[PDB]
Specification:
The PDB classes it as transferase. Keywords: transferase. Crystal Structure Analysis of the E.coli holoenzyme. Chain A: DNA-directed RNA polymerase subunit beta. The organism of A is Escherichia coli. The structure is cut from a larger assembly and holds chains A (50 residues) and B (48 residues). With 50 residues, chain A is an alpha+beta fold. Chain A has helices at residues 8-13, 18-25; strands at 31-32, 39-40. In chain B, 0% of the residues are buried. Chain B has three helices and no strands. Classes of the chains: A alpha+beta (50), B mainly alpha (48).
Chain lengths: 50, 48
């Protein structure tokens, strides 16, 4: 019943760096700079609800 | 950016009600005491 703490703080105690936590709870979006002037990888289902 | 205790107070007032658990965690990292609460519930209770 103790005082509230930000969730991620437990993961850190499990030896997970911020990069690792992000790697866990979020998918990836690959931004390619190819030739010049940014290109992006697109999973066709990502465009739902936007 | 900061000042802590406002915050539990200002929220406790606008809601009109706060659970006994609502104030405990919303309290600043400064006062953790058990018998601290005893009189302060009487403080918030005469006001809302």
């Amino acid at each position: 019943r103790r005082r509230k703490l930000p969730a991620t703080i437990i993961l850190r105690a499990l030896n997970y760096t911020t990069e690792q936590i992000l790697d866990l709870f979020f998918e990836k979006v690959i931004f390619e700079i190819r030739d010049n002037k940014l290109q992006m990888e697109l999973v066709p289902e990502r465009l739902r609800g936007e | 950016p900061q000042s802590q205790l406002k915050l539990l107070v200002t929220r406790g007032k606008e809601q009109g009600y706060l659970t006994y658990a609502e104030v405990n965690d919303h309290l600043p990292e400064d006062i953790v005491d058990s018998d601290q609460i005893e009189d302060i519930i009487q403080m918030i209770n005469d006001m809302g």
